[PDB]
Every structure is written in structure tokens, then in C-alpha cells.
Design an enzyme around this catalytic site. Structure first.
Site, PDB file in Angstrom:
ATOM      1  N   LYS A 240       0.834  -1.193   0.000  1.00 46.84           N
ATOM      2  CA  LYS A 240       0.000   0.000   0.000  1.00 46.84           C
ATOM      3  C   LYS A 240       0.879   1.257   0.000  1.00 46.84           C
ATOM      4  O   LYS A 240       0.386   2.332  -0.285  1.00 46.84           O
ATOM      5  CB  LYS A 240      -1.004  -0.063   1.162  1.00 46.84           C
TER       6      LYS A 240
ATOM      7  N   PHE B  68      13.634  -4.905   2.807  1.00 44.51           N
ATOM      8  CA  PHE B  68      14.741  -5.576   3.468  1.00 44.51           C
ATOM      9  C   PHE B  68      14.217  -6.395   4.642  1.00 44.51           C
ATOM     10  O   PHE B  68      14.444  -7.596   4.707  1.00 44.51           O
ATOM     11  CB  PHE B  68      15.737  -4.482   3.867  1.00 44.51           C
TER      12      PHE B  68
ATOM     13  N   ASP C  69      12.457 -11.533   7.040  1.00 47.59           N
ATOM     14  CA  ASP C  69      11.509 -12.057   8.013  1.00 47.59           C
ATOM     15  C   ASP C  69      10.840 -13.334   7.497  1.00 47.59           C
ATOM     16  O   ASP C  69      10.563 -14.260   8.267  1.00 47.59           O
ATOM     17  CB  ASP C  69      10.458 -11.014   8.354  1.00 47.59           C
TER      18      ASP C  69
ATOM     19  N   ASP D  75      10.815 -16.868   9.339  1.00 49.49           N
ATOM     20  CA  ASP D  75       9.537 -17.461   9.764  1.00 49.49           C
ATOM     21  C   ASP D  75       9.193 -18.713   8.962  1.00 49.49           C
ATOM     22  O   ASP D  75       8.246 -19.397   9.298  1.00 49.49           O
ATOM     23  CB  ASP D  75       8.327 -16.572   9.506  1.00 49.49           C
TER      24      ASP D  75
ATOM     25  N   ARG E  78       3.531 -13.679   0.628  1.00 44.30           N
ATOM     26  CA  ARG E  78       3.580 -12.285   1.051  1.00 44.30           C
ATOM     27  C   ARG E  78       3.038 -11.358  -0.052  1.00 44.30           C
ATOM     28  O   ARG E  78       3.495 -11.425  -1.197  1.00 44.30           O
ATOM     29  CB  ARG E  78       5.050 -11.947   1.355  1.00 44.30           C
TER      30      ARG E  78
ATOM     31  N   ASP F 172      11.454 -10.297  19.769  1.00 42.97           N
ATOM     32  CA  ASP F 172      10.330 -11.115  19.324  1.00 42.97           C
ATOM     33  C   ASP F 172      10.769 -12.569  19.244  1.00 42.97           C
ATOM     34  O   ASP F 172      10.069 -13.437  19.753  1.00 42.97           O
ATOM     35  CB  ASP F 172       9.718 -10.668  17.996  1.00 42.97           C
TER      36      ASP F 172
ATOM     37  N   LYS G  48      10.192  -2.968  17.124  1.00 44.10           N
ATOM     38  CA  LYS G  48      10.137  -3.778  15.928  1.00 44.10           C
ATOM     39  C   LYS G  48       9.273  -3.145  14.839  1.00 44.10           C
ATOM     40  O   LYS G  48       9.598  -3.342  13.666  1.00 44.10           O
ATOM     41  CB  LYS G  48       9.632  -5.190  16.216  1.00 44.10           C
TER      42      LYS G  48
ATOM     43  N   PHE H 186      -1.987   0.979  16.529  1.00 41.23           N
ATOM     44  CA  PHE H 186      -2.295   0.324  15.263  1.00 41.23           C
ATOM     45  C   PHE H 186      -1.838  -1.137  15.279  1.00 41.23           C
ATOM     46  O   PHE H 186      -2.434  -1.964  14.607  1.00 41.23           O
ATOM     47  CB  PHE H 186      -1.760   1.061  14.031  1.00 41.23           C
TER      48      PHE H 186
ATOM     49  N   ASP I  71      -4.243  -4.337  14.862  1.00 40.22           N
ATOM     50  CA  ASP I  71      -3.866  -5.360  13.902  1.00 40.22           C
ATOM     51  C   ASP I  71      -4.031  -6.730  14.566  1.00 40.22           C
ATOM     52  O   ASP I  71      -4.572  -7.658  13.972  1.00 40.22           O
ATOM     53  CB  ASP I  71      -2.486  -5.034  13.348  1.00 40.22           C
ATOM     54  N   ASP I  72      -3.617  -6.847  15.827  1.00 38.21           N
ATOM     55  CA  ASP I  72      -3.716  -8.118  16.537  1.00 38.21           C
ATOM     56  C   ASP I  72      -5.183  -8.524  16.703  1.00 38.21           C
ATOM     57  O   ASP I  72      -5.550  -9.681  16.493  1.00 38.21           O
ATOM     58  CB  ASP I  72      -2.954  -8.091  17.856  1.00 38.21           C
TER      59      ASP I  72
HETATM   60  O1  LIG Z   1       4.761 -12.043   9.510  1.00 34.21           O
HETATM   61  P1  LIG Z   1       4.636 -10.551   9.464  1.00 34.21           P
HETATM   62  O2  LIG Z   1       5.533  -9.948   8.416  1.00 34.21           O
HETATM   63  O3  LIG Z   1       3.207 -10.111   9.270  1.00 34.21           O
HETATM   64  C1  LIG Z   1       5.181  -9.838  11.077  1.00 34.21           C
HETATM   65  N1  LIG Z   1       6.543  -9.299  10.949  1.00 34.21           N
HETATM   66  C2  LIG Z   1       6.840  -7.968  10.959  1.00 34.21           C
HETATM   67  N2  LIG Z   1       5.823  -7.070  10.958  1.00 34.21           N
HETATM   68  C3  LIG Z   1       6.113  -5.763  10.951  1.00 34.21           C
HETATM   69  N3  LIG Z   1       7.329  -5.223  10.942  1.00 34.21           N
HETATM   70  C4  LIG Z   1       8.358  -6.081  10.948  1.00 34.21           C
HETATM   71  S1  LIG Z   1       9.984  -5.751  10.971  1.00 34.21           S
HETATM   72  C5  LIG Z   1      10.510  -7.370  11.030  1.00 34.21           C
HETATM   73  C6  LIG Z   1      11.920  -7.770  10.913  1.00 34.21           C
HETATM   74  C7  LIG Z   1      12.206  -9.028  10.388  1.00 34.21           C
HETATM   75  C8  LIG Z   1      13.509  -9.403  10.132  1.00 34.21           C
HETATM   76  C9  LIG Z   1      14.581  -8.547  10.372  1.00 34.21           C
HETATM   77  C10 LIG Z   1      15.962  -9.026  10.048  1.00 34.21           C
HETATM   78  C11 LIG Z   1      16.860  -8.207   9.179  1.00 34.21           C
HETATM   79  C12 LIG Z   1      17.227  -8.468  10.576  1.00 34.21           C
HETATM   80  C13 LIG Z   1      14.294  -7.269  10.834  1.00 34.21           C
HETATM   81  C14 LIG Z   1      12.985  -6.881  11.082  1.00 34.21           C
HETATM   82  C15 LIG Z   1       9.437  -8.197  10.950  1.00 34.21           C
HETATM   83  C16 LIG Z   1       8.178  -7.492  10.946  1.00 34.21           C
HETATM   84  P2  LIG Z   1       5.167 -10.952  12.550  1.00 34.21           P
HETATM   85  O4  LIG Z   1       3.818 -11.618  12.516  1.00 34.21           O
HETATM   86  O5  LIG Z   1       6.293 -11.973  12.461  1.00 34.21           O
HETATM   87  O6  LIG Z   1       5.322 -10.002  13.741  1.00 34.21           O
HETATM   88  O1  LIG Z   2     -14.050   1.157  13.206  1.00 36.34           O
HETATM   89  P1  LIG Z   2     -15.438   1.201  13.787  1.00 36.34           P
HETATM   90  O2  LIG Z   2     -16.086   2.587  13.655  1.00 36.34           O
HETATM   91  O3  LIG Z   2     -16.297   0.135  13.202  1.00 36.34           O
HETATM   92  C1  LIG Z   2     -15.203   0.715  15.520  1.00 36.34           C
HETATM   93  N1  LIG Z   2     -14.278   1.754  15.980  1.00 36.34           N
HETATM   94  C2  LIG Z   2     -14.376   2.360  17.174  1.00 36.34           C
HETATM   95  N2  LIG Z   2     -15.453   2.116  17.960  1.00 36.34           N
HETATM   96  C3  LIG Z   2     -15.518   2.738  19.146  1.00 36.34           C
HETATM   97  N3  LIG Z   2     -14.610   3.572  19.659  1.00 36.34           N
HETATM   98  C4  LIG Z   2     -13.525   3.832  18.896  1.00 36.34           C
HETATM   99  S1  LIG Z   2     -12.216   4.834  19.212  1.00 36.34           S
HETATM  100  C5  LIG Z   2     -11.418   4.506  17.761  1.00 36.34           C
HETATM  101  C6  LIG Z   2     -10.111   5.079  17.402  1.00 36.34           C
HETATM  102  C7  LIG Z   2      -9.830   5.353  16.067  1.00 36.34           C
HETATM  103  C8  LIG Z   2      -8.604   5.879  15.710  1.00 36.34           C
HETATM  104  C9  LIG Z   2      -7.616   6.117  16.658  1.00 36.34           C
HETATM  105  C10 LIG Z   2      -6.337   6.697  16.180  1.00 36.34           C
HETATM  106  C11 LIG Z   2      -5.663   7.782  16.922  1.00 36.34           C
HETATM  107  C12 LIG Z   2      -5.055   6.445  16.853  1.00 36.34           C
HETATM  108  C13 LIG Z   2      -7.882   5.832  17.993  1.00 36.34           C
HETATM  109  C14 LIG Z   2      -9.118   5.327  18.362  1.00 36.34           C
HETATM  110  C15 LIG Z   2     -12.155   3.685  16.976  1.00 36.34           C
HETATM  111  C16 LIG Z   2     -13.365   3.248  17.616  1.00 36.34           C
HETATM  112  P2  LIG Z   2     -14.573  -1.012  15.885  1.00 36.34           P
HETATM  113  O4  LIG Z   2     -15.440  -1.933  15.058  1.00 36.34           O
HETATM  114  O5  LIG Z   2     -13.122  -1.054  15.460  1.00 36.34           O
HETATM  115  O6  LIG Z   2     -14.721  -1.308  17.368  1.00 36.34           O
END
Ligand SMILES: O=P(O)(O)C(Nc1ncnc2sc(-c3ccc(C4CC4)cc3)cc12)P(=O)(O)O
Ligand SMILES: O=P(O)(O)C(Nc1ncnc2sc(-c3ccc(C4CC4)cc3)cc12)P(=O)(O)O
Ligand SMILES: O=P(O)(O)C(Nc1ncnc2sc(-c3ccc(C4CC4)cc3)cc12)P(=O)(O)O
Ligand SMILES: O=P(O)(O)C(Nc1ncnc2sc(-c3ccc(C4CC4)cc3)cc12)P(=O)(O)O
Ligand SMILES: O=P(O)(O)C(Nc1ncnc2sc(-c3ccc(C4CC4)cc3)cc12)P(=O)(O)O
Ligand SMILES: O=P(O)(O)C(Nc1ncnc2sc(-c3ccc(C4CC4)cc3)cc12)P(=O)(O)O
Lengths: 337, 337
Positions: free
Chosen positions: A48, A89, A94, A98, A103, A165, A187, A226, A230-231
Site C-alpha cells: 500500500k 529488506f 523475516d 519465519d 507475502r 520477538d 520492531k 495500530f 492489527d492483533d
Molecule cells: O509475519 P509478518 O511480516 O506479518 C510480522 N513481521 C513484521 N511485521 C512488521 N514489521 C516487521 S519488521 C521485522 C523484521 C524481520 C527481520 C529482520 C531481520 C533483518 C534483521 C528485521 C525486522 C518483521 C516485521 P510478525 O507476525 O512476524 O510479527
Molecule cells: O471502526 P469502527 O467505527 O467500526 C469501531 N471503531 C471504534 N469504535 C468505538 N470507539 C472507537 S475509538 C477509535 C479510534 C480510532 C482511531 C484512533 C487513532 C488515533 C489512533 C484511535 C481510536 C475507533 C473506535 P470497531 O469496530 O473497530 O470497534
């Protein structure tokens, strides 16, 4: 949309990025350079581009329009692509570590026939290209060294995060909140949230330690939020909406969900968790999910979101100056899924 | 011996190197930092330290003794260790990619129980430590950026070299002299011969492009010679003397020997080579060796050495100024085996 506005030009620049990284005054590295072209084309394209684009959006919001010559913009696009190359990179590497299969809707590079563990070198080439680009496009700029240091530090922080991690997930004893928060910060949050704004800041002449500390404070808290989202969405997301079909439980991750679950579980629930976390079969994945539901973690999440909105709006109120709030707010809107 | 003189102090500094790279104002990366300590201790220690020591020897030969304060020396030792950390990065990674079992008389790091492909991250941490050290010890120095650029470029050149080696050796058609010479130059010679002198040069205020081009010309030709020697000694060395029990033929390398052999072979000899190169069994390794002997490649080598002595002494005569010849000559003596 301020990102949709910048996008077409940012992506078109990739072509130039490649040309300059490949164009034979030294003839006999030709073949290696050709391999470099393939590595860039496969691994830097198809995301993206949120992180790279953030550099460009922030640049435009932070530099007065009188200083947005064709050349300043080339630089902005280039630095944006530098962030994308950093991402590439990390992800190539990664995927090897893993043992991933896919991907970005394609076979991971290392899994392609005749690449294999050569991808390790390829990953390193992607990293190298950052500093080549910075040299070629920004050597004469006053922020050059600032950008070199920022990228190298971002790499260091991410790698340290990865180490944490890896140590944490080789046993649920290890999945604590202080630990989870620390993984997320080093990370993902530093290079995903701080790095792109910070680059734009330096390109705009905003180089002060306080200003950086202030932007950082906001951005690391955004990055935590965020990642936690995501989790959550990994399991309780609708995959048609998010695009991710979750596999965190099977994959045995230190996810926010499991951490919260651990904090709440009775000794017997710990056991149901110990028994089902990290399995292939759906039967078992469903018993982990059903436990999270039992413990009402969605409500816990909802509450976390609400709290988190107030906190982050307050952080921006207090710490955004003298940057425009819209830098932070524009990024929040873009990432939120 | 000028290297034996500098050695004890250089190696003692490693302790400091580690301390500073690990010493917990941020508590919860503790565990990751501990892993960092183990990675440094296992992989940066146990070599001959020729490359790192060259930085220290050259520093002493190039800076007037009035400017060799305790502090300048700390820096010299640190930068020397930066070269050793670069070496370690390459070798940890190379061992993974080659599927090696042993290195420096011990199990390769990635083969140690519970490391595996996590070594990829570990390798990257070693690389990261270069720039952390450069910052901590030389940020305020006028040569700081010069050193950052030199290390990053040395990394880029080595990686490109590795790419060429990987493409060349995945078929004897590919094993040409122009190709062999090109692998050696990018993959070993730049970082083994140019980098350490170049660092010392920059630390001494010798930053001119001409001076660098001149040192480089000598040093890349030295690096080619020492790699070709290394290739010869792999087979015809006495392992008790050299320390290396050769496995180039089995391992299917683009070695100088095979290149020369290819140039000389009749169509039928090509076939004996095509038939025996890259096998386990000694029976076959002996038929490759016996062919090299048949084609009298030792005499070819001897001649190459003689020619090469004249050329390199002449290069130093012409291009060493205004550096002391002893910089070049001291390094030749040290490496020659
Ligand atoms: O499987 P993914 O990619 O969704 C995720 N991995 C990551 N997501 C977001 N940012 C990063 S940075 C990172 C990483 C991996 C390998 C390295 C090696 C070059 C040293 C450095 C950073 C993995 C990762 P995770 O589920 O293992 O946490
Ligand atoms: O995304 P929505 O409207 O369906 C809902 N979102 C929310 N519902 C109730 N309270 C809140 S506060 C909130 C939010 C959005 C962005 C941020 C960004 C500054 C980091 C922080 C909190 C999203 C949200 P959920 O289905 O993820 O629970
Ligand atoms: O097996 P070795 O270590 O004796 C030897 N390898 C090397 N010798 C000297 N210098 C270098 S630098 C190098 C290398 C390996 C991996 C990388 C990856 C990080 C990208 C970069 C450089 C391998 C190597 P080779 O027999 O495969 O040619
Ligand atoms: O759809 P709604 O409004 O009934 C409700 N959503 C919200 N309720 C209360 N506060 C908020 S703040 C919020 C939101 C969503 C996305 C953003 C993006 C700019 C980051 C910001 C705030 C959604 C929401 P929910 O029942 O889906 O959780
Ligand atoms: O090492 P030696 O004395 O046993 C013998 N060495 C030589 N014999 C005859 N001619 C020459 S010229 C030569 C030499 C040494 C160092 C250099 C360094 C400048 C690169 C270049 C050529 C070594 C040598 P060899 O057993 O390797 O064939
Ligand atoms: O032992 P030798 O002298 O009879 C003879 N060696 C040499 N003959 C002629 N020129 C040279 S130059 C040479 C040499 C060896 C090591 C060095 C080290 C400083 C790099 C420099 C020159 C050995 C040698 P060889 O029959 O072993 O090849």
C-alpha cells in the site's frame, strides 16, 4: 484523500529509482545489477506504500510551497522509496526466518525456484540501496547526515525488536504486557510511524531534538495502537474487509489478545490456552477463540480503543506544535482499518 | 613485527567495545542486548584480525606521533573493530547461504542449537553495531561522514560481489578470467585491502579523491594477488602450514586454478573436468588435481607470482606517495602465506 493525491507520482518515480540504481560503466557487474533489478521489482512493489507516502505527504505539509521545486519533490519521492526499501529488506528476511510461503499475494522471494537462501544477500542489497539513493539524491543537502543516521538507527531499533520477538516466541510465561509493548515499539513503531515523519521533518529543516522527541512521543503511541488493532483484527476482523486471514494463534505469536487473555485467565483457563495455542487444526483454533470470547476481550478492546482515542488526540493537542496536527491526523486516518 | 606490537591492545579493547554496546537505561530490551553480547562474543572473536589491525598499524604510520593521544587510539582501535564487525556480518551470513558446518575452528553460529535462521537477524545486528560505534566514538570528528560512507560503500561492493559469485556458481562455461577477477575485486579486495587503509587515511585527514584512487589501485591489485594465492594453496598448500584443508573442488568454486585449467584444456580434458568437479569422493578430487598437475598449473602460478611481485612493487613505487611505502609493504608481509 491527501495520500491518493500524491500516490500516482510516487509510484511512477519507482521507475527512475530503478534506472539510477542500474544505469553499466563497469561492464562485468552487469549480471549482478540485473539480479538487483529483479530483486527491487519483486520485493519493493505491491504494498500500500503507506510508509513511503507518509514521507511525501508530510513533506508537502511541512515545507512552505515556495520551496517545493521539481527537485525537492524528486528528493521527497526518493526518500519515501528509501523507507519502502527498508520495509522490503525487513520483510524478505523475516519471511526466510519465519519459513513463510506467501507475502503481498505472491510467493515469498526466497521460495521462488533458484533463489532460496541467496535471498539473504538480496535482502542486504535492498538495505544497501537506501544509502546509495540518499547519496545520489541528497549528498549536497544539509539534512544528508541526519537522514543517514535516522535510517541506520531505524534499522538498529527494528533489528533489536526482532531479537526480542525471536527470544519471546521460540511458553506463555513470556507473553507479558511490558514485553509485548516493548516488541511493538522497537520492531514496528519506530520505523513505521516515527521514521517517515522524522525524515520529512529533517528534509524541512526541522532538526531539533525537542521537536523530534515530541513527534516521536505521538507517533510511537500511534504505532502501539495500530499494532494492537492489527492483533485484534487478525482474529475478529472480517477478512473480506481487512484482507488478512488471521493465523496469529496457530503461528504462536505474542499477540495483544493472548496477553490480555493471560492477565484474566483462571488457572484452568491458562490450561485450555496452553493446550490449544499454536496448533494446525481449526478444532483447536476455535477453542482459543471461544476462550477469548468467554473472557470478553472484544469489549476489552472496544474500551482500549475509546481510551486510546482520547489519549492520542490529547497527545497531538499537546505535542504536535509546531507541526500541523494534520500530519498526525492524516496518518491515523490512512492506517486505520 | 608491527602487527604483533599493536595486537594485545587491539584485542583488549574488544572488552570496551562490548561494554559500550550493552551498557540498561531502557530495561526491557535487556534480554535482546544479552543476545547481542553472545553474538559479538561468538562471531567477532577468534580470527587473525588482519583487517582490523591494518587500521591500527596504518593509523600509526600515517598520523604524526604528536597527534596519537589516548583518545585518537581508542578511535583507531574502535574503527579497527568496526572492520572486524563487518567481516563477522559477512561470514555469519555466508555460512548460512553456503550451508557450512564449521568456521574459525568452531560450529558456525547458525548451526548452534536454537539459533538457526535467527542468525540472519544476528548478522544484521553485527552490521548495525558498526554505525553505533562510529557514532559513539567519532561523531564529533571531521572524518565521521567519510567513514560512514566508506563502510556503507564497502558493504555494497561486497554484496554485489557476492551476487556475482552466487550467479556464477549456482557449469564451467561461466568460469572466465574477466569474471573471476571481477568477483575477487568486489567480494573480497575492496573490504579486505582498500577499506582498512582508507579508514586510516580518513582518520589521518587524507581525504583527497586522488590519494584514495592511488591507494585503491595498489590495494585492489594486492587483494587479487592474495586471493589467487589463496586459491592455489587450497589444493597445493600444505594444510599443516596454511591451516586450511582445501575443499574448493568439491565445493565447486570459481577458483583461479579452474579458470587457468579451462583456458588450457583440450576438448577431452574439459570433459574429464566436467566429469569430476564438485564431487564428494576423493577418487574424483584426485583426478581434478592430477589434471591441474598435467597442465602444469603450479609453474603457471610460480610465473604469476614472479610477474606479480614486479608489478606490485612498481605500483607502490609509483602510487604510494604521499603515504609511506611501509603501509603497503607491511600489509603484504602480514597477509602472505
Ligand atoms: O509475519 P509478518 O511480516 O506479518 C510480522 N513481521 C513484521 N511485521 C512488521 N514489521 C516487521 S519488521 C521485522 C523484521 C524481520 C527481520 C529482520 C531481520 C533483518 C534483521 C528485521 C525486522 C518483521 C516485521 P510478525 O507476525 O512476524 O510479527
Ligand atoms: O471502526 P469502527 O467505527 O467500526 C469501531 N471503531 C471504534 N469504535 C468505538 N470507539 C472507537 S475509538 C477509535 C479510534 C480510532 C482511531 C484512533 C487513532 C488515533 C489512533 C484511535 C481510536 C475507533 C473506535 P470497531 O469496530 O473497530 O470497534
Ligand atoms: O567460504 P568462505 O568464507 O571461505 C568464502 N567466502 C568469502 N570469503 C571472503 N570474503 C567474503 S565476503 C562474503 C559475503 C557473504 C555473504 C554476504 C551477505 C550479506 C549479504 C556478503 C558477503 C563471503 C566471503 P567462499 O569460498 O564462499 O568464496
Ligand atoms: O459506527 P459507530 O459510530 O456507531 C461506533 N464507532 C465509534 N463510536 C464512537 N467513537 C468513535 S471514533 C471512531 C473512529 C473511526 C475511525 C477513525 C479514523 C481517523 C482514524 C477515527 C475515529 C469510530 C467511533 P462502533 O459501534 O462501530 O464502535
Ligand atoms: O613463499 P615461497 O618463498 O616458498 C614461494 N614464493 C615465491 N616464489 C617465487 N617467486 C615469488 S614472487 C612472490 C611474491 C610475494 C609477495 C607478493 C606481494 C606483493 C603482493 C608478490 C609476489 C612470492 C614468490 P612459493 O612456494 O609460494 O612459490
Ligand atoms: O625459497 P627461495 O628463495 O629459493 C624461492 N623464493 C623466492 N624466489 C624468488 N623471489 C622471491 S620473492 C619471495 C617473497 C616471499 C614472501 C614475501 C612477503 C613480503 C610479502 C615477499 C617475497 C620469495 C621468492 P622458491 O623456490 O621457494 O619459490
Amino acid at each position: 484523500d491527501v495520500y491518493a493525491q500524491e500516490k500516482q507520482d510516487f509510484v511512477q518515480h519507482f521507475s527512475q529509482i530503478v534506472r539510477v540504481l542500474t544505469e553499466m560503466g563497469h561492464p562485468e557487474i552487469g549480471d549482478a545489477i540485473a539480479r538487483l533489478k529483479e530483486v527491487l521489482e519483486y520485493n519493493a512493489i505491491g504494498g500500500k506504500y503507506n510508509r513511503g507516502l507518509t514521507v511525501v505527504v508530510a513533506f508537502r505539509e511541512l515545507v512552505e510551497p515556495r520551496k517545493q521545486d521539481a527537485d525537492s519533490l524528486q528528493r521527497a519521492w526518493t526518500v519515501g522509496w528509501c523507507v519502502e526499501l527498508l520495509q522490503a529488506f525487513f520483510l524478505v528476511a523475516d519471511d526466510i526466518m519465519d519459513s513463510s510461503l506467501t507475502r503481498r499475494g505472491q510467493i515469498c522471494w526466497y521460495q521462488k525456484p533458484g533463489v532460496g537462501l541467496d535471498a539473504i544477500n538480496d535482502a542486504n542489497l535492498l538495505e544497501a540501496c537506501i544509502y546509495r539513493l540518499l547519496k545520489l539524491y541528497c549528498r549536497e543537502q544539509p539534512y544528508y547526515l541526519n537522514l543517514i543516521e535516522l535510517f541506520l538507527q531505524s534499522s538498529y531499533q527494528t533489528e533489536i525488536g526482532q531479537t526480542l520477538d525471536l527470544l519471546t516466541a521460540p511458553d506463555l510465561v513470556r507473553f507479558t504486557e511490558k514485553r509485548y509493548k516493548s516488541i511493538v515499539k522497537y520492531k514496528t513503531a519506530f520505523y513505521s510511524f516515527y521514521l517517515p515523519i522524522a525524515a520529512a521533518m529533517y528534509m524541512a529543516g526541522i532538526d531539533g531534538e525537542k521537536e523530534h522527541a515530541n513527534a516521536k512521543k505521538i507517533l510511537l503511541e500511534m504505532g502501539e495502537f495500530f499494532q494492537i488493532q492489527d492483533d485484534y483484527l487478525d482474529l475478529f476482523g472480517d477478512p473480506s474487509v481487512t484482507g488478512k486471514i488471521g493465523t496469529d494463534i496457530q503461528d504462536n505469536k505474542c499477540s495483544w489478545l493472548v496477553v490480555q487473555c493471560l492477565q484474566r485467565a483462571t488457572p484452568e483457563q491458562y490450561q485450555i490456552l496452553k493446550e490449544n495455542y499454536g496448533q494446525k487444526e481449526a478444532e483447536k483454533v476455535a477453542r482459543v477463540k471461544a476462550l477469548y470470547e468467554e473472557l470478553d476481550l472484544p469489549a476489552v478492546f472496544l474500551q482500549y480503543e475509546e481510551d486510546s482515542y482520547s489519549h492520542i488526540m490529547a497527545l497531538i493537542e499537546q505535542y504536535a506544535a509546531p507541526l500541523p496536527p494534520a500530519v498526525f491526523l492524516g496518518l491515523a486516518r490512512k492506517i486505520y482499518k
